[PDB]
Design a binder for this molecule. Structure first.
Ligand code: 23R
Length: 255
């Protein structure tokens, strides 16, 4: 019974623009990673919080990785159709509130269920839950983060759906501090309608079944991950000399 309206010329353009934006801001070879401060993995088989906080051995590298990724997300956001129609103030509120969520989403591309790691090259740039531990985070973040990565993998999103989801995540009218919620909602609705239309006319069954609702649930999951990351970052920040292991951009976004 369900009607399948064709994607409009505008919706086709929105998709092409977002794919282009992603291809310009996500290097699938991870070739810049050697420029970051090097990863260091202390011996921590026991998962000692005292040792993890004393050394924060993976923090400089992972902070550089996250900081780089925030820069890329800023570039991607600026190409979202309608984003530049927002005031600078609203653009910045949206970027700061969504950055960690878009990082977790976009990282799904390097995540692999082969061994449950983010595989970004040789051994040095293969990231596991134990690396997150070594950057001062705990199971309350790691467990739901891995569950999220696998759940998102198993949706088998088309790249079109993946880039639309990132855009929808960023252009959210319910973020604290937004001024023009109605304009943000209009931009988001244009994206959401594109996604709903795309799924209904371009995604074959049975993977298409209730797919939009599943994607919306992943956005809710990301809000929870954001809250948990924030709580843990706050405590990480209490570690003397932590700021030198971060970056000015990371300090601003999470502090
Ligand atoms: C960040 C990305 C990539 C991987 C993401 C990972 C692997 C390492 C640990 C990360 C960065 C995780 C996503 C979230 C997770 C995190 C929980 C955030 C960091 C939080 C911080 C220490 C800054 O508070 C520590 O580890 C590689 C690649 O997919 C992209 C460059 C993507 O943007």
């Amino acid at each position: 019974d369900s009607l399948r309206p064709k994607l409009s010329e505008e919706q086709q353009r929105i998709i092409a623009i977002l794919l282009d934006a992603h291809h310009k801001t996500y290097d699938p070879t991870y070739s810049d990673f050697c420029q970051f401060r090097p990863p260091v993995r202390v011996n921590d088989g026991g998962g000692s919080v005292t040792l993890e906080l004393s050394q924060l051995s993976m923090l400089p590298h992972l902070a550089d990785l996250v900081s780089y990724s925030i820069q890329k997300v800023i570039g991607f956001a600026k190409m979202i159709p309608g984003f530049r129609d927002l005031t600078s103030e609203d653009q910045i509120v949206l970027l700061k509130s969504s950055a960690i969520e878009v990082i977790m989403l976009r990282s799904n591309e390097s995540f692999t269920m082969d061994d449950m790691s983010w595989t970004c090259g040789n051994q040095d740039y293969k990231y596991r839950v134990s690396d997150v531990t070594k950057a001062g985070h705990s199971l309350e973040l790691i467990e739901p983060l891995i569950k999220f990565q696998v759940g998102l993998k198993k949706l088998n999103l088309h790249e079109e759906e993946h880039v639309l989801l990132m855009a929808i995540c960023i252009v959210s009218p319910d973020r604290p501090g937004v001024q023009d919620a109605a304009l943000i909602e209009a931009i988001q609705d244009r994206l959401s309608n594109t996604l709903q239309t795309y799924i209904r006319c371009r995604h074959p069954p049975p993977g298409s079944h209730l797919l939009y609702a599943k994607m919306i649930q992943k956005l809710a999951d990301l809000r929870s991950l954001n809250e948990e990351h924030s709580k843990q970052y706050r405590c990480l920040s209490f570690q003397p000399e932590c700021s030198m292991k971060l970056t000015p951009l990371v300090l601003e976004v999470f502090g």
